[PDB]
Amino acid sequence: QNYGINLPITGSMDTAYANSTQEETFLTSTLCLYYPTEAATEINDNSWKDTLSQLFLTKGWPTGSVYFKEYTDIASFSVDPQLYCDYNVVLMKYDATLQLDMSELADLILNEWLCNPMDITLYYYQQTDEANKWISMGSSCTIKVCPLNTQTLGIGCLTTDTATFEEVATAEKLVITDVVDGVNHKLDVTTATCTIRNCKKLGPRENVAVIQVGGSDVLDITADPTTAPQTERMMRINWKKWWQVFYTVVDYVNQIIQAMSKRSRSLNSAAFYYRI
């Protein structure tokens, strides 16, 4: 009602707890499950969606509300990922050679990003503060940078010759680039097949959980080397059969949704802050 303003809220201790609202949210919320193709392959049952829907029905969710979205692999899913359900759960398979790419994907979907358009053919770009990154996604995004000085001359590079530009991304499907702050960088990006955006990490995205399937603690959703936080929405599971993984996800869905929350940036209260 008073949408554009942040009015302080006064709460009283000893105010009685409301009853559990888990049943109501399960009855009014949509749960998108994201899994890789190899999961469906190994399961090898064309009716498994119906079985999972019935199991969720036993666990509370109405049998029209759980969605299953399939992606090929981590690198492909990272291109313009779109998580539209009330609650999104991503079964991300672990690979020892894709640690940075898993970290980038989680950082992109476990946190809320406010992205402004980048025109590297028009402007020199600079990162203001520690929350400001350059997020680029596409079929193949290769990014080279030239850090400039106060006189606009390049440092260790020449603005005219792009071959000297320091290379920070090669043939990436998603890459979050962090450079020194306050220094203007000329950017050479393969814009033809990938978009770069100047983004700010507003805060967590609480309606998205990532379960790392069969790896170790490697995700780094913060560019600061001194911090490697393990939020409640980044789980890890050992596995041999994808059926057991899905069974665990169903059986502990109460716990999973507990670790998440309705997208704060969403819903009517957020109106006139950024979205809805």
Partner 1 sequence: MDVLYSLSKTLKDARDKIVEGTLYSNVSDLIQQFNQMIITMNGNEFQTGGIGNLPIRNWNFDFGLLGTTLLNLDANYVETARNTIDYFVDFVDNVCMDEMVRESQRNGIAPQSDSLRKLSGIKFKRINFDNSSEYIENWNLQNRRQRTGFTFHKPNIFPYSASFTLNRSQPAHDNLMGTMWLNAGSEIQVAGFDYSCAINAPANIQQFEHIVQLRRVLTTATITLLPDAERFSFPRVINSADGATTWYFNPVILRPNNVEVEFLLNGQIINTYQARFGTIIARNFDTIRLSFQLMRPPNMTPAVAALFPNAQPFEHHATVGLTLRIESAVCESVLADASKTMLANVTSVRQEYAIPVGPVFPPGMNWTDLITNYSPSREDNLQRVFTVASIRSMLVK
Annotated binding site for Ca(2+): 45, 127, 156, 164, 166, 178-179, 181, 251
Residue 276 binding: pick among Ca ion, its own copies, partner 1, none (C-beta 5-8 Å cut-off by kind): its own copies
Name the minimum Å distance from CB 161 to Ca ion: 9
Longest dimension (CA), the chain: 68
- Using the structure block, give the residue that is written with the tokens 């450079």: 179
Name the minimum Å distance from CB 268 to partner 1: 11
Name the minimum Å distance from CB 101 to Ca ion: 4
Distances (CA, A) of 263 to 37, 98, 103, 253: 27, 28, 21, 18
Residues 194-233 that bind partner 1 (CB under 8 A): 201, 203-204, 206, 222, 224, 226-227, 229, 231
Instruction: Note whether 86 binds its own copies by CB under 8 A.
Output: yes
* Distance linking the first and last C-alpha atoms of the chain: 13
Tokens coding 260: 């998440």
Nearer to partner 1, 43 or 202 (CB): 202
Residue 157 binding: pick among partner 1, Ca ion, its own copies, none (C-beta 5-8 Å cut-off by kind): Ca ion
Distances (CA, A) of 197 to 67, 103, 113, 137: 30, 18, 10, 9
Least Cα distance to 259 among 237, 231, 238 occurs for 231
Write the CB contacts of 130 (distance below 8 Å, at least 6 apart in sequence): 181, 223, 224
Residue 247 binding: pick among Ca ion, partner 1, its own copies, none (C-beta 5-8 Å cut-off by kind): none
Tokens coding 111: 């946190």
Q: Using CB under 8 A, which of the segments 10-18, 59-67, 116-124, 136-144 binds partner 1? A: 10-18
Tokens coding 266: 């969403």
Helix (H, G, I), strand (E, B), or coil: what is residue 236? strand
**Footprint on this chain of Ca ion (rule: CB under 5 A):** 101, 104, 127, 156-157, 164, 172, 175, 178, 181, 220, 222, 224, 227-228
The binding site for partner 1 (CB under 8 A) comprises 1-6, 8-18, 21, 130-131, 201, 203-204, 206, 222, 224, 226-227, 229, 231, 261-264, 271-272
